[PDB]
Design a protein around this ligand. Structure first.
Ligand SMILES: Nc1ccn([C@H]2C[C@H](O)[C@@H](CO)O2)c(=O)n1
Ligand SMILES: Nc1ccn([C@H]2C[C@H](O)[C@@H](CO)O2)c(=O)n1
Ligand SMILES: Nc1ccn([C@H]2C[C@H](O)[C@@H](CO)O2)c(=O)n1
Ligand SMILES: Brc1ccnc2[nH]cnc12
Ligand SMILES: Brc1ccnc2[nH]cnc12
Ligand SMILES: Brc1ccnc2[nH]cnc12
Ligand SMILES: *[C@@H]1C[C@H](O)[C@@H](CO)O1
Ligand SMILES: *[C@@H]1C[C@H](O)[C@@H](CO)O1
Ligand SMILES: *[C@@H]1C[C@H](O)[C@@H](CO)O1
Lengths: 157, 157, 157, 157, 157, 157
């Protein structure tokens, strides 16, 4: 098969986020239309190897912030597809921004929602930016060579 | 004497959001470089007048959603400036998306934060999309004819 | 009192096209939110004054074509609003292209259809690019300072 | 060889359209730089499997129209190359729009004209959006890995 | 009576550059379609007032560079028109970049060349990005409300 | 490995330019993440085979200039990556423009500087457009499948 690369848009700040993250990453490893090795994973592309957790003084460093912001934008713009791991109860402003950038860069925008949450209401603008929204259990078999437009089968506020 | 129009980006989903919203609107009324009458306020431009809070039957109507999403994008693209009323503790995914769209449409992107919150950490991607970020009490006097790039005097996460 | 400029998108290749053209121009003269004098009219901006109808020697001149094409794109990109005078039975490929360019340049895209034709089916892609579609008799009073998204009250094919 | 995907921009509303469609599709099947399987063919991507011919009531459904319009845009934006099967005597507004969108998305824009019609006049804006225009008989051997800019060897009005 | 704002694109690194700069600024002061007061002049918008010529300690500060680069992009994107003061014998890479950004932001791109140099060859890519190119002595009277595409009356290389 | 294509942005007007050109081309031949055959090399894509050196009358031909400019833009837009061979002492306005276009087209923008010059000051706008800047000796081993954002380790004016 041909393979496409993605940007792994996913929060890592809550238990539900980290669960969905692990699940989505596992689904991508099993999906044969995805080149995960050459995809952009934010958490493995930390500027200069420095760990924002082990040294939180870097959250006042404007150079760190500039480089990290730009790395993410670059990760979106140089890969085929924008993936948003999306928790309806824990909606993320950063992801929202990235979705808007992905749209502007002409990328397919795919949201993935945990099966337990699929159907719960999501922000209108999330509903609208997305080209499609699927459940976590569909991610391993999603054909990224033939991405199509569809509507969320769920609520929007 | 020259005046600019804005898109009023703001959540309306919490008490702090609604407080900041009311404050920002009052600041705009007093700002002599702003034409507020010809500006786009999402809450007054929802398809058919309906708000999914006041009429929850439209929470699954895809026509309402399509038209409302598109009207907001149109409100961003046809106005001079993008405004984001921004609560650091209650960040909004919808606004995040709109910030990214505004960037893509070449708009000055100004965040306004309540004075009581100015300085609190904001999402890196919000920090990065923004051209500038000011406090609520600066909004009435901000010169929208000479908008400049500046860094938030505050943290990111 | 604020005024917007437009690009006058319209075919001039049939009797119905020319009729609608004349009507739309008269409506614009009477509309107080339009600065028609500073607007771009393709037919008056062809390279060197020449019209391939009035001087068919320029039908193979690539310089004339380059300059005229570029001037039209420039006329779209430097004006506030994109207008498409639109005959459902005599749709125009050139205008279609210009609608797509206008979309890409972040312009409000307004179709105007002769009252006698308003409601007739229009191409899906015209329906979709457009932000709104109105009847000729609405054009003189349309408020270009507060342009909104609306759906055609009519069919597509 | 490396292979590129396309969007199959072609009308299906006249005898000449359907002839050129069949020919262009055959040429693509034989072209070794094209991955036709993973290309976007509108007519095989009808929303929800519903047949606009067998159920023409869906031409008043705004959801059907929204999804179909968006699928086409998505088909253009997620594929490498924009292909416009172009009949000079039957110029298509929908294709025109799609050409403008393709330009905006940074795609190579290739028009293909039946050999019997190559040379006949085409709209200036079609001439201008295109990066190249070739005859149907050149399509099977076109090297899509090395697409180049050239001018139509033909008239433009 | 309507006025446009500009971005003052110009090198300041040679005697001819500085001469042309002074001349162009004087022309703009006298041009009644230009609002010079609300226009963006890079040299007066450098981060913190500092010029790497007057304070060379900032020649390795990445914060100064980030903010100054971003302010210039912002100055281009929030003003109506892109101006390039252009010396054919002393072409400037920085201005070149800014011309390309201006193009991407849908701005009219006007080059102005000292009368003594008008006609000398200019880089092809400068020739191509530009919408028009005029002589210094035309700048005071140029009608920025009706900007049109025209070709340089001069050579390229 | 997956391979990416590039646009070979490099002047050919000085001894230092031609040296860096030869070196960069050699590095690309040895880099296994690059498909050089299907990359766009300006100097081998001269319009219609005509040699601007052997026939310098074509530098007044507007058709030659139109086609050549458009070929370059096309070469940037249809390839994966923008490469700028960059001489700090011989900065090129044409390259600058192309860098701005590449940014606008969503491309990774890589500057390459001869090792003997790496560290010398470069224009701010060059520093800013670039996603990364490396030395000639790093080009053969650069992983174009995982391009990342970084800052020039050098001066900027
Ligand atoms: N029902 C909704 C939800 C969101 N928004 C837009 C406007 C606000 O700025 C932001 C709120 O999340 O997104 C909207 O217009 N209507
Ligand atoms: N000779 C031509 C052909 C087309 N057009 C542009 C302007 C019209 O809106 C549309 C007409 O097809 O395209 C033009 O300016 N000149
Ligand atoms: N230190 C610098 C270098 C360049 N520029 C911008 C503004 C000029 O138009 C162009 C000069 O090279 O680029 C700038 O603002 N500051
Ligand atoms: Br830390 C960090 C790294 C990358 N993206 C982010 N978005 C918000 N915080 C972020
Ligand atoms: Br039905 C239909 C489907 C897809 N594209 C179209 N353009 C005009 N009608 C269309
Ligand atoms: Br000749 C020539 C060919 C291609 N690009 C160029 N840029 C400046 N001169 C050029
Ligand atoms: C960008 C990376 C991640 O997807 C989000 C977190 O807020 O921002
Ligand atoms: C988009 C699909 C097809 O190419 C045209 C028909 O008008 O619109
Ligand atoms: C575009 C091709 C080359 O890279 C430069 C020369 O000025 O312009």
């Amino acid at each position: 098969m041909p393979k496409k690369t993605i940007y792994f848009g996913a929060g890592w700040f809550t238990d539900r986020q980290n669960k969905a993250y692990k699940e989505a990453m596992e689904a991508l490893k099993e999906n044969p239309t995805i080149d995960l090795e050459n995809s952009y994973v934010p958490l493995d592309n930390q500027y200069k190897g420095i760990r924002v957790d082990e040294h939180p003084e870097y959250l006042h460093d404007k150079v760190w912030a500039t480089a990290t912001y730009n790395n993410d934008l670059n990760g979106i713009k140089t890969n085929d597809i924008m993936l948003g791991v999306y928790i309806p109860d824990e909606e993320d402003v950063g992801l929202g921004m990235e979705l808007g950038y992905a749209l502007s860069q002409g990328k397919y925008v795919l949201l993935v929602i945990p099966d337990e949450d699929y159907g719960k209401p999501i922000n209108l603008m999330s509903w609208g930016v997305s080209d499609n929204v699927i459940k976590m259990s569909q991610l391993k078999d999603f054909n990224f060579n033939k991405p199509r437009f569809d509507f969320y089968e769920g609520a929007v506020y």
